[PDB]
Amino acid sequence: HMPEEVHHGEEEVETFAFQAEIAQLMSLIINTFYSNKEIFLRELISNASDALDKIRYESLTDPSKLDSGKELKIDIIPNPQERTLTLVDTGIGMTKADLINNLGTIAKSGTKAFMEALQAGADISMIGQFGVGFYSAYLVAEKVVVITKHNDDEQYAWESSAGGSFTVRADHGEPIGRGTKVILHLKEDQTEYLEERRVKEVVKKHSQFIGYPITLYL
Ligand SMILES: CC(C)c1cc(C(=O)N2Cc3ccc(F)cc3C2)c(O)c2cnoc12
Question: CB within 8 A of 92, min separation 6: which ones?
Answer without folding.
Answer: 51, 52, 54, 55, 58, 150, 151, 178, 179
